[PDB]
Amino acid sequence: SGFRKMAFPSGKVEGCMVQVTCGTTTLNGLWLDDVVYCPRHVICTSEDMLNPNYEDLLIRKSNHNFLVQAGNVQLRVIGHSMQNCVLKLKVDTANPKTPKYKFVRIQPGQTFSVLACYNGSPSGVYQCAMRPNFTIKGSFLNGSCGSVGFNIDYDCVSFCYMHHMELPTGVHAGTDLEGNFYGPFVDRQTAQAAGTDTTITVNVLAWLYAAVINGDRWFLNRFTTTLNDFNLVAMKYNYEPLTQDHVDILGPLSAQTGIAVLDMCASLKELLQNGMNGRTILGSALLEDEFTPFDVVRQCSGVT
Amino acid sequence: SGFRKMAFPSGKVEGCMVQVTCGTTTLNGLWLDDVVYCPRHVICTSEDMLNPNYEDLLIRKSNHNFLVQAGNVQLRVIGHSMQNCVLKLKVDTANPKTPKYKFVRIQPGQTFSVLACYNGSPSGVYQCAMRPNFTIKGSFLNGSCGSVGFNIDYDCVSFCYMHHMELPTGVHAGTDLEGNFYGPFVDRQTAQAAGTDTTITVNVLAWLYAAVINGDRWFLNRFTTTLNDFNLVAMKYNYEPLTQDHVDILGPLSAQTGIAVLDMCASLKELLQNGMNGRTILGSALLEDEFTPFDVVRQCSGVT
Ligand SMILES: Cc1ccncc1NC(=O)CCc1ccccc1F
Numbered sequence A, B: 001s002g003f004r005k006m007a008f009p010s011g012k013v014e015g016c017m018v019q020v021t022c023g024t025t026t027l028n029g030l031w032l033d034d035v036v037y038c039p040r041h042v043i044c045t046s047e048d049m050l051n052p053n054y055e056d057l058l059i060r061k062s063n064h065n066f067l068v069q070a071g072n073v074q075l076r077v078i079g080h081s082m083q084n085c086v087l088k089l090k091v092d093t094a095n096p097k098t099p100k101y102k103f104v105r106i107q108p109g110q111t112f113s114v115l116a117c118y119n120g121s122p123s124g125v126y127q128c129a130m131r132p133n134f135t136i137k138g139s140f141l142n143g144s145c146g147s148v149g150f151n152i153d154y155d156c157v158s159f160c161y162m163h164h165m166e167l168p169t170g171v172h173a174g175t176d177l178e179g180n181f182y183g184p185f186v187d188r189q190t191a192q193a194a195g196t197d198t199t200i201t202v203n204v205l206a207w208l209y210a211a212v213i214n215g216d217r218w219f220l221n222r223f224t225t226t227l228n229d230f231n232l233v234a235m236k237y238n239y240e241p242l243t244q245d246h247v248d249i250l251g252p253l254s255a256q257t258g259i260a261v262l263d264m265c266a267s268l269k270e271l272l273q274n275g276m277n278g279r280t281i282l283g284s285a286l287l288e289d290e291f292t293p294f295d296v297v298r299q300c301s302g303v304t
């Protein structure tokens, strides 16, 4: 028992981190097989910041201008190409530490672990959610670009995020591993609107189930609700509308605890309307939405 | 910017995890050089649970009864000994993945990362604090015993915790790597009092500094206090009394932000006396005490 915001073990990803330098800019790259992936903005200088012409900037670069160092050994770059907002540097040596991996585009509301890196060296790991507005609230400083987000399914690493930007609001934006941004963001030093965000309802309900499993039950009540009634409350409080697909994904937690999904919705409705009353749930004084129903099941069953 | 409850990258520790089976019990062991460390209760059966005579239970075991498997390869056990509450199994092969390491006994209030494991396989990593009462609030299920806590200083892993028990209250207890319990706990299936816990004041202040650095400043006020006045409030609210050693450790954060430690104490005093008023600090609706001043500095500067 106990419930923590747990990240996946980062070892398989640590073995893929490299440093990429082009000109005076250094950031992180991900070395998988004989390719190093990194944000294309490694080719920018301070004057280019506002609206870089990446095609023209890249034309001024040759393979030998991309300095790739895997810890302390230098990689030989034999090709370079830009795919969306990422650069792919072909190297002459396959990473001996390449895990089984996939590139996936995650959905908003899904969670993943980030391995924060600086100069190709891992500094820490944390779990987070891709917000409904496609931003992430991470911990990134200058030099962290190229750090990646991922999930692990036993031996397979599914890479889902590569860090590119900090918006002027202090929230973060990045791409899938094909270089496509999540959200409306562009890799330019320009103020950019992140959409209206919402709280991930299905994750809050999953976390209320994790709370009941771990002994925090004070929020359970004598009520029930309907999806329609619950969605009026979700609307008022800027929560994602709950659908039958969400109720279906909560099936295992409802089956394990014996608390019907709509009865848990009535507990969530009461907490939204009345607050916590100075109490806590799993050590939090707010409704947590960074655990998916899969995360709760994995953590509550001991999956490795 | 942004501030997260970040764990150390777990790779160096993942390479040390093994499974240890003795009889019908399986738990995790830590393989460093040619020694595997694990909780001694791996030698218990269900009847022994209440008050095991570990010396007698261990006398019934030979080297060949300890089955140690490093992922999928079997280790040959050539010696066994009990040191306090840990067993040390000498193996004929040094772990090729042994990082530079130290065994340290952490102080209450210090933080560390836990790599939760089941059957010698890592399942997740999270950061936590050793409570002032020597318990930890982790996420551990049956089979997680032998999972370890650690800190990393560039290339050196300082192992500080090995998991042994879940108290009937759902909080966790364990030992240093010499097998000495943190706190008054014994490895028996008996209800055991954890002392009165307190909130780690110096960590809350460190986290208020991390909040100001990251833009959350609404809690700053026009007041100041003294250590004496602050400690009367700390007393009322079950916070650790603040000392000059704590003020000294907060020096770097005070210097960086320009907010004198006693002025931050006056913000903390007001938050204790008035609550958050439905507001948040770094995404939390409570005062967080699981970041030390060193953690804040490391995270806010980008240390790898
Ligand atoms: C400074 C920082 C901090 C944290 N995470 C990320 C960053 N870096 C950025 O936001 C870089 C912004 C940028 C500017 C010019 C061209 C492309 C581009 F993506």
Ligand SMILES: Cc1ccncc1NC(=O)CCc1ccccc1F
Pocket: A001, B041, B044, B048, B049, B050, B052, B140, B141, B142, B143, B144, B145, B164, B165, B166, B167, B187, B188, B189
């Ligand atoms: C069940 C569980 C869950 C999480 N963490 C740990 C555990 N396991 C325990 O508490 C084992 C308790 C014990 C009983 C008999 C002899 C020694 C001993 F330490």
